Design a protein around this ligand. Structure first.
Ligand SMILES: [Cl-]
Ligand SMILES: [Cl-]
Ligand SMILES: [Cl-]
Ligand SMILES: [Cl-]
Ligand code: NA
Length: 129
């Protein structure tokens, strides 16, 4: 599924991401936009052999099992394919674990390079929330 901007904002808000660990909703929408272009089926292979999955490009090295990242962990205790569903519940729950782990949203390279320090509220402007 390819979400609309406000549709995704509303889905993320319902799942408790607005101000989760101090990150306003605009941060999450911005990160999704630049990680996956709002596409739940996005995948990207990294040079170390791991793969990023889903709307928030969650990595198989630590967070999910895809059966082909040897020596990796599965800290969200899910198959990586569950992160490609049109229902974002699994991605959101896993992202909550990630952003709680310590480095906050700096775990998302696209957020750090393209959302951090910008007017992220612009990503939820106009939406009925
Ligand atoms: Cl915001
Ligand atoms: Cl771009
Ligand atoms: Cl594996
Ligand atoms: Cl933080
Ligand atoms: Na893994």
């Amino acid at each position: 599924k390819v979400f609309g901007r406000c549709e995704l904002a509303a889905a993320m808000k319902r799942h408790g991401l607005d101000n989760y660990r101090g990150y306003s909703l605009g941060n999450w929408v911005c990160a999704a936009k630049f990680e996956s272009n709002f596409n739940t089926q996005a995948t990207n292979r990294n040079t170390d052999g791991s793969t990023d999955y889903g709307i928030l490009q969650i990595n198989s090295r630590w967070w999910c099992n895809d059966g082909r990242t040897p020596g990796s962990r599965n800290l969200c205790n899910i198959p990586c394919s569950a992160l490609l569903s049109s229902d974002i519940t699994a991605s959101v729950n896993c992202a909550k674990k990630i952003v709680s782990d310590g480095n906050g949203m700096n775990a998302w390279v696209a957020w750090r390079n393209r959302c951090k320090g910008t007017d992220v509220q612009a990503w939820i402007r106009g939406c009925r929330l």
